[PDB]
Design a protein around this ligand. Structure first.
Ligand SMILES: C[C@H]1CN(c2cncnc2)Cc2cc(NC(=O)c3cc(CN4CCN(C)CC4)cc(C(F)(F)F)c3)ccc21
Length: 280
């Protein structure tokens, strides 16, 4: 596994129950593939067996995820306690905070740069599909920003209090990000690659809004659940996210295709990348 002796503390990026996150420095990297900045999630020596089990299930998943636009697992420290996972560290935080702090061309962001960010997301989602892996929680909050506008798709679960509003419970049953979920996810619980395309659609709406508003921000969580019912009903009472001001009708009709009632009609990520890379 990874030598703990090679991890040099810099900052405590945060804490929670059963663990805490650290930013560390690694000299002369001859373990991975001038010191390298790494992100370390460490399990508390007080953590429950349920907490230990969840950590090793998460390590198992991440170990297969190897793509330039997906968060890499550099290593683990599982042989002894406390258990830890080492990922790449993305200096500019998540895409939501990154976009929220910028204005369109407080630094600026250009329309081609917005599309370039949305292109990395599609190319990344394309990879997970080739592995037949459903993300289940794609949104800007779950996208990390690095040097030279690089985007790497991550998943924080429901660990950050900042995004508590993006999740609807449903107890007790299942805490869900309904505002990003397709109609079939809400009514049936049928998560697929085709429903990830719907989430991608909503994510591209977020990017073109520059993370300024929450999807269906004027409607209640119950009203959004009601709206999934109208897509199944197909009588013309179904509603959609409005066109962002800085969005041409062209790119808007793309978002609309991610919102086709039939999952077969929704375009795949290979097609979504190619359009975001060619048409502007
Ligand atoms: C080190 C620490 C801090 N870190 C950081 C902080 N600041 C700047 N840079 C980096 C980011 C980070 C991220 C993770 N986990 C992932 O990235 C993730 C995990 C899975 C599978 N789990 C989903 C959640 N579920 C509850 C359990 C299963 C899916 C996917 C993918 F499929 F989307 F790729 C990626 C773990 C630790 C850390």
């Amino acid at each position: 596994d990874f030598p703990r002796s090679r991890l040099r503390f810099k900052e405590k990026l945060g804490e929670g129950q059963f663990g805490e996150v650290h930013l560390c420095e690694v000299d002369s990297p001859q373990d991975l593939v001038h010191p390298l900045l790494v992100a370390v999630k460490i399990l508390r020596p007080d953590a429950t067996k349920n907490a230990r089990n969840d950590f090793l299930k998460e390590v198992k998943i991440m170990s297969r995820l190897k793509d330039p636009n997906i968060i890499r697992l550099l290593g683990v420290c599982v042989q002894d306690d406390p258990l830890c996972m080492i990922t790449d560290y993305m200096e500019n935080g998540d895409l939501n905070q990154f976009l929220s702090a910028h204005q369109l061309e407080g630094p600026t962001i250009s329309y081609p740069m917005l599309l370039h960010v949305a292109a990395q997301i599609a190319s990344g989602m394309r990879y997970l599909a080739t592995l037949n892996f459903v993300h289940r929680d794609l949104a800007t909050r779950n996208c990390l920003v690095g040097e030279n506008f690089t985007i790497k798709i991550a998943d924080f679960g429901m660990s950050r209090n900042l995004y508590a509003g993006d999740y609807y419970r449903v107890q007790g049953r299942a805490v869900l990000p309904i505002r990003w979920m397709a109609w079939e996810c809400i009514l049936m619980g049928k998560f697929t690659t085709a429903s990830d395309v719907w989430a991608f659609g909503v994510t591209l709406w977020e990017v073109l809004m520059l993370c300024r508003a929450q999807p269906f921000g004027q409607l209640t969580d119950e009203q959004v659940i009601e709206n999934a019912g109208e897509f199944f009903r197909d009588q013309g009472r179904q509603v959609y996210l409005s066109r962002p001001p800085a969005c041409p009708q062209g790119l808007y009709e793309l978002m609309l295709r991610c919102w086709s009632r039939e999952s077969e009609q929704r375009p795949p990520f290979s097609q979504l990348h190619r359009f975001l890379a060619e048409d502007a």
